[PDB]
């Protein structure tokens, strides 16, 4: 199930999220719980609390389910996942950010110094989220990725990676930063200082 990574919508605006089974939609505020919105069968079922706020449809042609959220408010900012029930298959989810701020791609700065620690600084982006990895996922063991923090309308995030010192810079390491909202990904190979 393919779902856009993010949608920045102006407050008061509407937005239509894209995605023999039931396609369900679930809402979740960052760091919060899970709420069931409703579902469709490409008959619909709405959670009474979400009637109207949400409108569920499906395009058999392109085979994609849609949920339209109307006149969004801060309360509406949350991850929305579509999950197919035949083992339900959860989607990657779309993080909807309701704000009047404009989308701003991040600046990605490399951070170089028995083990050695390299880092990656991701500054000034909006809105969330960003998907950071190292060597496109090859490295995970020595990884620490700190939750972004909002400061003056801009998010800032860092990530560190620790590896056997004798293997860097000899065995190259690269920071990868995806920013769905701005549709840009950036790779910064960490070089010795």
């Amino acid at each position: 199930l393919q779902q856009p990574g993010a949608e920045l919508v102006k407050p008061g605006a509407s937005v239509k999220l894209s995605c023999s089974s039931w396609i369900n939609w679930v809402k979740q505020r960052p760091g919060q719980g899970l709420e069931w919105i409703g579902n469709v069968y490409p008959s619909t079922n709405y959670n009474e609390k979400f009637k109207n706020k949400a409108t569920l449809t499906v395009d058999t042609s392109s085979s994609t389910a849609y949920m339209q959220l109307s006149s969004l408010t801060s309360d509406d900012s949350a991850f929305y996942y579509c999950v197919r029930k035949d083992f339900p298959y959860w989607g990657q989810g779309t993080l909807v950010t309701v704000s009047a701020a404009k989308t701003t791609a991040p600046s990605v700065y490399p951070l170089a110094p028995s083990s050695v620690t390299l880092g990656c600084l991701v500054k000034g982006y909006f809105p969330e989220p960003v998907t950071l990895t190292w060597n496109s996922g090859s490295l995970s063991s020595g990884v620490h990725t700190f939750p972004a923090v909002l400061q003056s309308d801009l998010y800032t995030l860092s990530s560190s990676v620790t590896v056997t010192s004798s293997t860097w810079p000899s065995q190259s390491i690269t920071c990868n930063v995806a920013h769905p909202a701005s549709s840009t990904k950036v790779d910064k190979k960490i070089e010795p200082r």
Binding site: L34, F87, Y109
Partner: protein, 218 residues
Amino acid sequence: EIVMTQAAPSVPVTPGESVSISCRSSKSLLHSNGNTYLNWFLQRPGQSPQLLIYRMSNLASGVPDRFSGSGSETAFTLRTSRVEAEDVGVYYCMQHLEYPFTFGSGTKLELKRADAAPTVSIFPPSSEQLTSGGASVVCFLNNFYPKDINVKWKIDGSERQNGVLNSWTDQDSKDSTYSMSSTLTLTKDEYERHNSYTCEATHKTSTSPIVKSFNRNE
């Protein structure tokens, strides 16, 4: 509608030990067809919930044998046996007996481990940031325990509190430790007018703080 309750935000457990997560519904989840519509999911930061148990006591495929589910018609329990570091996360129960489907509040699994001192690293601003006029000095205090920790920035000896933003990671799924990142931001103008930059980690594992510093000139 049906209310799912989880009377515990989090639960503590020593690695290797067993533990139980509880959940309750406001009505019997047992359908006349003999089945009991209760799911148990696990969610790790930045990931969608992963299925662990279906129909109250059925181990989902791919999930280690260490997980098991049981219950009455309104009380449900998820047992995690021989707990491991990778088990950290939030567990949710969910009923799908009736529309609207409802989820319990979730219970976060927290590992009680041995104390660990932080490994501190300091990074000067990158040349790319300087060319844009900003100067961020970054310090990583990695793999420590307990979670509580303090950082202190100093410039040429004077403590600097403004332009400092910190961020803690969730409990590490590898070694069950915690980490924190501290960033001091200045303009190049001011960054170029001071020489020594220092961050100081003060954790329970020690009286005197772990300090790291560098000199723009050196």
